[PDB]
């Protein structure tokens, strides 16, 4: 019957049923292939559909990432001036500087002086405000789903949740435009994490072109996992890192074939980015900073210390941001998203313009911090490198920036614009690591008499490398705020290329994960999932409460008896009334009202669809005709919509085993029986609600 | 009761029961921790036990790998002479060459001449024969399990199979000695793959030191997965590659925490190898060959061609080796393992000595082939690089070697000595890729007028890099013979460090996997698992036969009724007689012989152990006392050994869902019932046998 087997919005899919549908389609297609040669070519196309869709998703993700990077760089450069000779060229490419003219030279006509500084300040603020206004208005008017990182929603979707329109074309376009707008605005956010959502949108749009991936939910989830891998790859140019992230972060179920498919998609996207090098390649992709000297054993001490910082700040953020977000979801603050975005952008621009580090783009700041001092470098971060008073000043200039980055982010992650949390955390950790490395280098230079320095360092030698400390701090902050261990480390290593610095990174990361784990085992993405109330049966959480299945059945003593359907003692009108009277997703069809022996399970959606189709197709089905759910007045027959083998457990079964079954098999509901007689039903909603109750939420 | 919950040799574990035991122990330990501060310290130790065991396993694996490499290098160098000045020094380190003296100089007294060549030939053959004899005798006399790679057995074990003594200390020591002996003998084998078994042995030996990992099988399997990751890491110096290999090859179930634990163990082992650099670091670990020029798009054509070769040869090997192995398991050839090893070693030495490439160590040959021609290099492989006649001769010298390497391996993988298949396949692929690269370079140099070469190459330019072709060929052969895609590619990339050659590798690998997949979807390890007859329910295989649970129940119409135990209508003597009369692993305890309603499941081992313990502990239990399985003449009580919630499915349930339940939940048996009455039992053995029957085995 047409329509049978579909799902509604904000519903969970049944993986077993979807896979049964997929293999039934596979058997039918194989039979057709053996039937004819044209069907054989169709079967070959069906087999190659997965490769085709993953390749298309990778190519689209790479192209979109390149375009977004180019547009964001140009728009960010527009704030501080423009290149009259070539308006399309950005500041860096325009000066590759008489061609570049600042707003002071174009309005006041003076390149220097207090008036020039004032004009530049006002123009910077105005451009930031305009970009923020455009981004928020576009998000609110066209695609409200384009707001946020999207990683929490993608995680919920890959678990089996349905969010219609989240991965649509409208959301893709609006997010693509608004991410560039927000990045140019200068808000404390990034465009690396959100790229995963863009890749997922592309994956869905391409999956619509293949019947195998367009009529089955599980195959769509596999394509989405590959898309997420490709998105991370384009974000950080780390295809292996992207595959690991898909494996450990967003993919609830990851078949082995999906591993290689996601790896191929990530490699294709990385190759697409390489082809347009350096046009669409970001600074992070082109980082490629060489190392001066190898790390040393004693240096692991400050690194671990950095880890502690990464463990602490992230925890604080998880406690702060969430709380603020909750206030936005409870008070009137959420009724004025445009005003909130405008105010945040104004404050950020005003407080960031005076300080060169904050006025600097976050990605460029990260690149500079990771970049090591050189003989040709004369930046304030490397003016001293003996050392002078300016060092202290430099440290001061860093410290303030750090504080700024810590504050704005808390009020920036959650606003109604595309915002990413990877870049801000990386910048904060990089600043902290740079400060720590500067301190360690100064101590080594002024106290080389210590046996540790005298053994592992030499007078007038590059024993200490602050760039490595900044990298370690960035990795520690990312791990402490996301609780990622392997994917994070591999992504950092691929981004920086420091194969010899994998050990220094890992350690720090682990430390952060432990420290944060002391203040809470939940990460930022999971915390946001819980805040939004999405149905998520996280496997990381362990159910320790000693309860039995009898304690979770909905039809309790106080509750009314569960609605059931007789095999062949029901009519179409009665079934319609039952559907319109009960709120159950499905109903268990029993043999008889006395025996109450389970016969099957019929979903309400399929039941209604079958009834309507039969009424519109045949004559005499006006309610008088009976409905028979058994096998072979024109009585209605609805055996095709019922499940012959619903999962069942005993009333005394410990709830831990039930949760295990639900997690591993991805079931939708389980019929709790005893003596072969139906008693109750435990649904994923009930399991989640019980888990929340036992967790004191 | 002591002894309850144990397993016998060659038996499969029940993952659900083990995990229940583990969490019950966790709850008890948490209660004790809350009881006292000493118990709190004990709880901290229990929590840190996993980190401690993985760290110990990594350290032991690294140390053993270094020692094995050093010993193998020295023993191999001993065959062609000795360093009189420093007998402990090897040929390369002795000449770092008056100090080094060949056997001709030490016996005949003439360094050059036909007599010197004859003496060197005879001494080489004698040393190879002696090493082979020692290895085979040690394997056959002390640890028969030390033979082979061990990857198939490790894969079976990680799926829940029990092989007592496979990972013991005796096996570890014997394999460690015999791997070095066999490598020195010159047989067509390697010591990289077998290192995984060494790591697993270390992991088991260390897991014996922690009660959490000593009393639970699943935790031991997690430790073994970490050990396998560390073993691969030490084998190829690719901790990420080792983690991926553990994820995709040997680990049936891989918890998320086990991922980070395995990564940490691999990193620790790699760091241990680094600390002893270059003493215990193999040539593969110290490969680190720089790259001259980047690869080009047209070069992807021959690379794919190499993939085809890798796809073909491997398939052939899977068809040849297995067959020969089957002959060794059916004819009298298997009755003389020592003689077979001696004959194979004699033939290999005799046929390899004349040709310099075969006389050369396989690892050194791989390093040379991957190594690119340089101005200071004057080797025959790079004598020409215009080109002369010698090129052809060089190619000839390669071609013969290739054929040799293809033949001996077929007769070498399966003998009663520690043998690895990674190194031979890598060498074969490297030779093929070197030949292909030489041909392509010659064509480009003599036919640069072609638009392709004129566009992507220049006159007198290093457009073609034969080392990259050799690397691609090695990767293709490895993928074709093992059907590994992501782990293989990452391992190769980490080994070579060519982050810019990931795309050329991947493609080729994929091609091989496809080509081999056309001649059979099973790899060498799975083929050997099937040949040995181990019980393996591979998840990669898909069950498409449309059968129901009723078709797999053992108690069929022809078979006798299933043995059952009444709840409280049985005696100790009757239960003992039933145990000694039936071969079932466990028996279903029913409420009554008339109702036949399932009450629980009692394992034969636990039943016998409980009966014996009760008889030896209490008085009056002499068979007259009744046995009651219900809850509360001194009747025996055996409720603690009975499972209250055995998994059950309906008789009409499709067998596909049953296979899914068995694979995902790792069950041991499922009770098939109808109307709430027990009918039959489907065990993993029956599922495996039905799968074999449906596969026409
Ligand atoms: C909000 C974003 C999307 C707007 C993008 C278009 C921007 C870059 C456009 C809008 C108005 C434009 C300006 C309009 C007028 C002039 C005067 C001319 O003598 C030099 C160029 C200059 C100064 C233009 C530079 C580019 C400009 C700033
Ligand atoms: C090894 C050295 C460098 C570490 C130095 C920092 C130490 C003192 C830090 C690291 C982790 C920290 C712990 C992390 C979290 C908690 C839980 C909280 O409810 C009380 C404090 C407590 C228990 C912290 C105490 C201080 C602590 C132990
Ligand atoms: C089979 C393996 C394990 C044996 C290991 C020990 C080997 C290396 C031993 C056994 C016999 C030894 C030889 C015995 C006698 C002499 C004569 C002396 O003037 C030079 C050293 C020389 C030539 C020895 C070299 C080392 C030697 C070959
Ligand atoms: C793309 C170019 C370079 C590939 C050139 C090699 C081609 C001809 C190879 C690659 C894979 C090969 C196929 C692989 C396996 C099979 C199955 C076998 O039962 C019949 C031959 C057949 C069908 C092969 C035919 C030839 C084949 C198609
Ligand atoms: Cl970001
Ligand atoms: Cl993000
Ligand atoms: Cl090997
Ligand atoms: Cl092997």
Short mmCIF file of N, CA and C in Angstrom, two decimals, chain A residues 16-17 19-20 23 26-27 51 239-240 243-244 247-249 256-257 259-260 263-264 267 271 274 295 297 485-486 489-490 493-494 497 499-500 502-503 506 510 513-514 540 542-544 546 597 599 644-650 652-654 656-657 660-661 663-665 675-676, chain B residues 16-17 19-20 23 26-27 51 239-240 243-244 247-249 256-257 259-260 263-264 267 271 274 295 297 300 485-486 489-490 493-494 497 499-500 502-503 506 510 513-514 540 542-544 546 597 599 644-650 652-654 656-657 660-661 663-665 675-676:
data_model
loop_
_atom_site.label_atom_id
_atom_site.label_comp_id
_atom_site.label_asym_id
_atom_site.label_seq_id
_atom_site.Cartn_x
_atom_site.Cartn_y
_atom_site.Cartn_z
N UNK A 16 15.73 -2.06 12.47
CA UNK A 16 15.48 -3.42 12.00
C UNK A 16 14.53 -3.41 10.80
N UNK A 17 13.45 -2.63 10.91
CA UNK A 17 12.48 -2.57 9.82
C UNK A 17 13.09 -1.96 8.57
N UNK A 19 16.25 -1.98 7.68
CA UNK A 19 17.20 -2.90 7.07
C UNK A 19 16.48 -4.05 6.38
N UNK A 20 15.38 -4.52 6.97
CA UNK A 20 14.57 -5.53 6.30
C UNK A 20 14.04 -5.01 4.97
N UNK A 23 17.00 -4.98 2.45
CA UNK A 23 17.38 -6.28 1.91
C UNK A 23 16.28 -6.87 1.04
N UNK A 26 16.87 -5.28 -2.15
CA UNK A 26 18.05 -5.88 -2.76
C UNK A 26 17.71 -7.21 -3.42
N UNK A 27 16.92 -8.04 -2.75
CA UNK A 27 16.52 -9.32 -3.34
C UNK A 27 15.69 -9.11 -4.60
N UNK A 51 28.92 4.75 -4.05
CA UNK A 51 30.13 5.46 -4.45
C UNK A 51 29.79 6.78 -5.11
N UNK A 239 41.50 14.21 6.41
CA UNK A 239 40.54 13.14 6.08
C UNK A 239 40.54 12.01 7.10
N UNK A 240 41.71 11.61 7.59
CA UNK A 240 41.76 10.60 8.64
C UNK A 240 41.10 11.13 9.91
N UNK A 243 37.35 11.03 9.40
CA UNK A 243 36.82 9.68 9.56
C UNK A 243 36.76 9.30 11.03
N UNK A 244 37.80 9.61 11.79
CA UNK A 244 37.79 9.30 13.21
C UNK A 244 36.69 10.05 13.94
N UNK A 247 33.52 8.42 13.27
CA UNK A 247 33.46 7.16 13.99
C UNK A 247 33.07 7.37 15.45
N UNK A 248 33.64 8.37 16.11
CA UNK A 248 33.58 8.47 17.56
C UNK A 248 32.63 9.55 18.08
N UNK A 249 32.15 10.46 17.23
CA UNK A 249 31.38 11.60 17.70
C UNK A 249 29.93 11.58 17.23
N UNK A 256 31.16 -1.29 8.57
CA UNK A 256 32.54 -1.30 8.11
C UNK A 256 32.67 -0.67 6.73
N UNK A 257 31.75 -0.98 5.82
CA UNK A 257 31.80 -0.39 4.49
C UNK A 257 31.70 1.13 4.56
N UNK A 259 32.94 2.97 6.72
CA UNK A 259 34.25 3.50 7.07
C UNK A 259 35.04 3.87 5.81
N UNK A 260 35.17 2.92 4.88
CA UNK A 260 35.93 3.19 3.67
C UNK A 260 35.22 4.21 2.79
N UNK A 263 35.98 7.55 4.27
CA UNK A 263 37.37 7.89 3.99
C UNK A 263 37.54 8.36 2.56
N UNK A 264 36.91 7.67 1.61
CA UNK A 264 37.00 8.08 0.21
C UNK A 264 36.37 9.46 0.00
N UNK A 267 38.74 12.07 1.37
CA UNK A 267 39.88 12.23 0.48
C UNK A 267 39.49 13.01 -0.77
N UNK A 271 41.07 16.53 -1.90
CA UNK A 271 41.65 16.71 -3.23
C UNK A 271 41.02 17.89 -3.95
N UNK A 274 42.59 20.86 -2.60
CA UNK A 274 43.96 20.95 -3.10
C UNK A 274 44.00 21.50 -4.52
N UNK A 295 60.85 18.09 20.71
CA UNK A 295 60.43 18.28 22.09
C UNK A 295 61.27 17.42 23.03
N UNK A 297 61.69 15.70 27.26
CA UNK A 297 60.89 15.03 28.28
C UNK A 297 60.38 16.02 29.33
N UNK A 485 39.23 12.58 22.13
CA UNK A 485 40.57 12.09 22.45
C UNK A 485 41.35 11.69 21.20
N UNK A 486 40.84 10.76 20.41
CA UNK A 486 41.58 10.24 19.26
C UNK A 486 41.35 11.10 18.02
N UNK A 489 43.11 14.49 18.49
CA UNK A 489 44.56 14.42 18.37
C UNK A 489 44.96 14.23 16.91
N UNK A 490 44.27 13.34 16.20
CA UNK A 490 44.62 13.10 14.80
C UNK A 490 44.33 14.33 13.96
N UNK A 493 47.14 16.78 14.60
CA UNK A 493 48.38 16.34 13.97
C UNK A 493 48.35 16.56 12.46
N UNK A 494 47.23 16.22 11.82
CA UNK A 494 47.12 16.42 10.38
C UNK A 494 47.12 17.90 10.03
N UNK A 497 50.80 18.87 10.93
CA UNK A 497 51.83 18.05 10.31
C UNK A 497 52.93 17.61 11.25
N UNK A 499 54.14 15.13 13.08
CA UNK A 499 54.09 13.72 13.43
C UNK A 499 54.95 13.40 14.66
N UNK A 500 55.97 14.21 14.93
CA UNK A 500 56.84 14.00 16.08
C UNK A 500 56.25 14.58 17.37
N UNK A 502 52.98 14.06 18.37
CA UNK A 502 51.74 13.37 18.71
C UNK A 502 51.70 13.06 20.20
N UNK A 503 52.82 12.61 20.76
CA UNK A 503 52.86 12.28 22.19
C UNK A 503 52.61 13.52 23.05
N UNK A 506 48.62 14.23 22.72
CA UNK A 506 47.77 13.22 23.35
C UNK A 506 47.70 13.41 24.86
N UNK A 510 44.36 14.07 27.02
CA UNK A 510 43.87 13.15 28.04
C UNK A 510 43.67 13.89 29.36
N UNK A 513 40.54 15.83 29.38
CA UNK A 513 39.37 14.97 29.47
C UNK A 513 39.15 14.50 30.90
N UNK A 514 40.23 14.19 31.61
CA UNK A 514 40.07 13.78 33.00
C UNK A 514 39.57 14.93 33.85
N UNK A 540 27.26 6.25 25.69
CA UNK A 540 28.30 6.53 26.67
C UNK A 540 27.75 6.45 28.09
N UNK A 542 25.82 5.01 31.16
CA UNK A 542 25.59 3.64 31.60
C UNK A 542 24.43 3.62 32.59
N UNK A 543 23.47 2.74 32.35
CA UNK A 543 22.30 2.60 33.21
C UNK A 543 22.63 1.62 34.33
N UNK A 544 22.77 2.14 35.55
CA UNK A 544 23.13 1.33 36.70
C UNK A 544 21.96 1.01 37.61
N UNK A 546 18.90 -0.61 39.28
CA UNK A 546 18.46 -2.00 39.26
C UNK A 546 16.93 -2.03 39.26
N UNK A 597 -3.11 -13.33 23.51
CA UNK A 597 -1.83 -13.83 23.02
C UNK A 597 -1.36 -12.96 21.86
N UNK A 599 -0.13 -11.44 18.59
CA UNK A 599 -0.13 -11.83 17.19
C UNK A 599 0.79 -10.94 16.36
N UNK A 644 5.10 -9.45 12.25
CA UNK A 644 4.91 -10.82 12.71
C UNK A 644 5.78 -11.17 13.91
N UNK A 645 6.94 -10.52 14.06
CA UNK A 645 7.90 -10.84 15.11
C UNK A 645 8.32 -9.58 15.85
N UNK A 646 7.44 -9.03 16.69
CA UNK A 646 7.84 -7.92 17.56
C UNK A 646 8.74 -8.41 18.69
N UNK A 647 9.70 -7.57 19.07
CA UNK A 647 10.62 -7.94 20.14
C UNK A 647 9.89 -7.96 21.47
N UNK A 648 10.16 -9.00 22.27
CA UNK A 648 9.48 -9.18 23.55
C UNK A 648 10.49 -9.57 24.62
N UNK A 649 10.23 -9.11 25.84
CA UNK A 649 11.03 -9.46 27.01
C UNK A 649 10.07 -9.79 28.15
N UNK A 650 10.60 -10.48 29.16
CA UNK A 650 9.79 -10.87 30.30
C UNK A 650 9.65 -9.70 31.27
N UNK A 652 10.13 -9.62 34.38
CA UNK A 652 11.19 -9.59 35.38
C UNK A 652 12.56 -9.32 34.78
N UNK A 653 12.65 -9.08 33.48
CA UNK A 653 13.94 -8.82 32.85
C UNK A 653 14.53 -7.53 33.40
N UNK A 654 15.79 -7.53 33.84
CA UNK A 654 16.39 -6.27 34.31
C UNK A 654 16.39 -5.23 33.21
N UNK A 656 18.51 -3.08 32.52
CA UNK A 656 19.80 -2.91 31.86
C UNK A 656 19.84 -3.67 30.54
N UNK A 657 19.33 -4.91 30.54
CA UNK A 657 19.32 -5.70 29.31
C UNK A 657 18.37 -5.07 28.29
N UNK A 660 20.20 -2.25 26.76
CA UNK A 660 21.18 -2.80 25.84
C UNK A 660 20.54 -3.19 24.51
N UNK A 661 19.39 -3.86 24.57
CA UNK A 661 18.71 -4.28 23.35
C UNK A 661 18.32 -3.06 22.54
N UNK A 663 19.65 -0.06 22.54
CA UNK A 663 20.81 0.64 21.99
C UNK A 663 21.42 -0.14 20.83
N UNK A 664 21.64 -1.44 21.01
CA UNK A 664 22.36 -2.21 20.00
C UNK A 664 21.50 -2.47 18.77
N UNK A 665 20.24 -2.85 18.96
CA UNK A 665 19.36 -3.16 17.84
C UNK A 665 18.58 -1.96 17.33
N UNK A 675 4.02 -15.46 30.65
CA UNK A 675 3.22 -16.64 30.36
C UNK A 675 2.71 -16.66 28.93
N UNK A 676 3.34 -15.89 28.04
CA UNK A 676 2.89 -15.79 26.67
C UNK A 676 1.75 -14.83 26.45
N UNK B 16 26.78 -11.04 27.29
CA UNK B 16 25.81 -10.45 28.20
C UNK B 16 26.10 -10.88 29.64
N UNK B 17 26.34 -12.18 29.84
CA UNK B 17 26.61 -12.68 31.18
C UNK B 17 27.90 -12.10 31.74
N UNK B 19 29.27 -9.23 30.96
CA UNK B 19 29.11 -7.81 31.27
C UNK B 19 28.27 -7.63 32.53
N UNK B 20 27.26 -8.48 32.73
CA UNK B 20 26.51 -8.46 33.97
C UNK B 20 27.42 -8.75 35.16
N UNK B 23 29.55 -5.58 35.83
CA UNK B 23 28.87 -4.47 36.49
C UNK B 23 28.46 -4.83 37.92
N UNK B 26 31.47 -4.18 39.79
CA UNK B 26 31.64 -2.74 39.91
C UNK B 26 30.76 -2.17 41.02
N UNK B 27 29.51 -2.62 41.09
CA UNK B 27 28.62 -2.14 42.15
C UNK B 27 29.14 -2.55 43.52
N UNK B 51 44.38 1.41 32.60
CA UNK B 51 45.52 2.19 32.14
C UNK B 51 46.83 1.47 32.45
N UNK B 239 51.02 4.04 15.15
CA UNK B 239 50.00 3.88 16.20
C UNK B 239 48.59 4.13 15.70
N UNK B 240 48.40 5.14 14.84
CA UNK B 240 47.08 5.35 14.24
C UNK B 240 46.72 4.17 13.34
N UNK B 243 45.71 1.31 15.57
CA UNK B 243 44.37 1.51 16.09
C UNK B 243 43.33 1.17 15.03
N UNK B 244 43.55 1.64 13.80
CA UNK B 244 42.60 1.35 12.73
C UNK B 244 42.54 -0.15 12.44
N UNK B 247 40.53 -1.75 15.00
CA UNK B 247 39.13 -1.41 14.80
C UNK B 247 38.48 -2.28 13.73
N UNK B 248 39.18 -2.48 12.61
CA UNK B 248 38.55 -3.02 11.41
C UNK B 248 38.89 -4.48 11.11
N UNK B 249 39.89 -5.06 11.77
CA UNK B 249 40.36 -6.39 11.41
C UNK B 249 40.11 -7.42 12.51
N UNK B 256 34.08 2.39 22.88
CA UNK B 256 34.71 3.68 22.59
C UNK B 256 35.93 3.91 23.48
N UNK B 257 35.82 3.59 24.77
CA UNK B 257 36.96 3.76 25.66
C UNK B 257 38.14 2.90 25.22
N UNK B 259 39.02 2.36 22.31
CA UNK B 259 39.71 3.07 21.23
C UNK B 259 40.84 3.92 21.79
N UNK B 260 40.54 4.77 22.77
CA UNK B 260 41.58 5.63 23.33
C UNK B 260 42.61 4.81 24.09
N UNK B 263 44.89 3.37 21.51
CA UNK B 263 45.74 4.43 20.97
C UNK B 263 46.87 4.77 21.94
N UNK B 264 46.55 4.87 23.23
CA UNK B 264 47.58 5.16 24.22
C UNK B 264 48.62 4.04 24.28
N UNK B 267 50.85 4.31 21.24
CA UNK B 267 51.76 5.44 21.38
C UNK B 267 52.88 5.11 22.37
N UNK B 271 56.80 5.05 21.48
CA UNK B 271 57.76 5.84 22.25
C UNK B 271 58.87 4.96 22.80
N UNK B 274 61.17 4.40 20.06
CA UNK B 274 61.91 5.63 19.79
C UNK B 274 63.05 5.81 20.78
N UNK B 295 53.45 13.77 -7.16
CA UNK B 295 52.82 12.92 -8.16
C UNK B 295 51.92 13.74 -9.08
N UNK B 297 48.59 13.66 -12.20
CA UNK B 297 47.31 13.00 -12.46
C UNK B 297 47.47 11.81 -13.39
N UNK B 300 48.28 8.34 -12.10
CA UNK B 300 47.24 7.50 -11.51
C UNK B 300 46.86 6.34 -12.41
N UNK B 485 41.50 -1.74 3.70
CA UNK B 485 41.36 -0.49 2.95
C UNK B 485 41.87 0.72 3.72
N UNK B 486 41.33 0.98 4.90
CA UNK B 486 41.69 2.18 5.65
C UNK B 486 42.91 1.95 6.53
N UNK B 489 46.02 1.61 4.28
CA UNK B 489 46.47 2.87 3.71
C UNK B 489 47.14 3.73 4.78
N UNK B 490 46.53 3.82 5.96
CA UNK B 490 47.10 4.64 7.02
C UNK B 490 48.43 4.06 7.49
N UNK B 493 51.01 4.98 4.89
CA UNK B 493 51.34 6.41 4.96
C UNK B 493 52.23 6.71 6.16
N UNK B 494 51.90 6.16 7.33
CA UNK B 494 52.73 6.39 8.51
C UNK B 494 54.11 5.78 8.34
N UNK B 497 55.63 8.09 5.54
CA UNK B 497 55.56 9.51 5.80
C UNK B 497 55.10 10.35 4.63
N UNK B 499 52.57 11.99 3.29
CA UNK B 499 51.23 12.53 3.44
C UNK B 499 50.67 13.05 2.12
N UNK B 500 51.52 13.36 1.15
CA UNK B 500 51.09 13.84 -0.15
C UNK B 500 50.81 12.71 -1.14
N UNK B 502 48.80 9.96 -0.20
CA UNK B 502 47.69 9.18 0.31
C UNK B 502 46.70 8.85 -0.80
N UNK B 503 46.41 9.83 -1.67
CA UNK B 503 45.47 9.58 -2.76
C UNK B 503 46.00 8.52 -3.72
N UNK B 506 45.50 5.00 -1.76
CA UNK B 506 44.11 4.61 -1.57
C UNK B 506 43.52 4.01 -2.84
N UNK B 510 41.99 0.31 -3.24
CA UNK B 510 40.60 0.05 -3.58
C UNK B 510 40.51 -0.87 -4.79
N UNK B 513 41.13 -4.40 -3.87
CA UNK B 513 40.01 -4.97 -3.13
C UNK B 513 38.87 -5.35 -4.06
N UNK B 514 38.62 -4.52 -5.08
CA UNK B 514 37.57 -4.86 -6.03
C UNK B 514 37.95 -6.09 -6.84
N UNK B 540 30.88 -9.57 8.38
CA UNK B 540 30.96 -9.14 6.99
C UNK B 540 30.05 -9.97 6.10
N UNK B 542 26.79 -11.77 4.91
CA UNK B 542 25.38 -11.43 5.06
C UNK B 542 24.53 -12.67 4.81
N UNK B 543 23.62 -12.96 5.74
CA UNK B 543 22.73 -14.11 5.62
C UNK B 543 21.50 -13.69 4.83
N UNK B 544 21.39 -14.20 3.60
CA UNK B 544 20.28 -13.85 2.72
C UNK B 544 19.22 -14.94 2.62
N UNK B 546 16.15 -17.17 3.18
CA UNK B 546 14.88 -16.85 3.83
C UNK B 546 14.38 -18.09 4.57
N UNK B 597 6.38 -24.36 30.54
CA UNK B 597 6.61 -22.92 30.49
C UNK B 597 8.02 -22.61 30.95
N UNK B 599 11.22 -21.34 32.61
CA UNK B 599 11.56 -20.73 33.89
C UNK B 599 12.97 -20.17 33.89
N UNK B 644 17.40 -16.17 34.84
CA UNK B 644 15.98 -15.85 34.91
C UNK B 644 15.44 -15.30 33.60
N UNK B 645 16.29 -14.73 32.75
CA UNK B 645 15.86 -14.06 31.53
C UNK B 645 16.67 -14.55 30.34
N UNK B 646 16.42 -15.77 29.87
CA UNK B 646 17.05 -16.22 28.63
C UNK B 646 16.39 -15.59 27.41
N UNK B 647 17.21 -15.28 26.41
CA UNK B 647 16.69 -14.68 25.19
C UNK B 647 15.81 -15.67 24.45
N UNK B 648 14.67 -15.19 23.94
CA UNK B 648 13.71 -16.04 23.26
C UNK B 648 13.20 -15.35 22.01
N UNK B 649 12.88 -16.15 20.99
CA UNK B 649 12.28 -15.68 19.76
C UNK B 649 11.17 -16.64 19.36
N UNK B 650 10.28 -16.17 18.49
CA UNK B 650 9.17 -16.99 18.04
C UNK B 650 9.62 -17.95 16.94
N UNK B 652 8.35 -18.53 14.12
CA UNK B 652 8.22 -17.97 12.78
C UNK B 652 9.17 -16.80 12.54
N UNK B 653 10.01 -16.47 13.50
CA UNK B 653 10.93 -15.35 13.33
C UNK B 653 11.92 -15.66 12.20
N UNK B 654 12.10 -14.76 11.24
CA UNK B 654 13.10 -15.01 10.19
C UNK B 654 14.49 -15.19 10.80
N UNK B 656 17.24 -14.27 9.72
CA UNK B 656 18.09 -13.09 9.60
C UNK B 656 18.10 -12.29 10.89
N UNK B 657 16.94 -12.11 11.51
CA UNK B 657 16.87 -11.37 12.76
C UNK B 657 17.58 -12.14 13.87
N UNK B 660 21.18 -11.53 13.43
CA UNK B 660 21.47 -10.19 13.91
C UNK B 660 21.58 -10.15 15.43
N UNK B 661 20.65 -10.80 16.12
CA UNK B 661 20.67 -10.80 17.58
C UNK B 661 21.95 -11.47 18.07
N UNK B 663 24.83 -11.82 16.52
CA UNK B 663 26.02 -11.04 16.20
C UNK B 663 26.14 -9.81 17.10
N UNK B 664 25.05 -9.05 17.23
CA UNK B 664 25.13 -7.78 17.96
C UNK B 664 25.23 -8.00 19.46
N UNK B 665 24.43 -8.91 20.01
CA UNK B 665 24.42 -9.15 21.45
C UNK B 665 25.42 -10.21 21.88
N UNK B 675 3.47 -19.63 21.87
CA UNK B 675 2.38 -19.60 22.84
C UNK B 675 2.89 -19.59 24.27
N UNK B 676 4.14 -19.17 24.48
CA UNK B 676 4.73 -19.18 25.80
C UNK B 676 5.27 -20.52 26.24
#
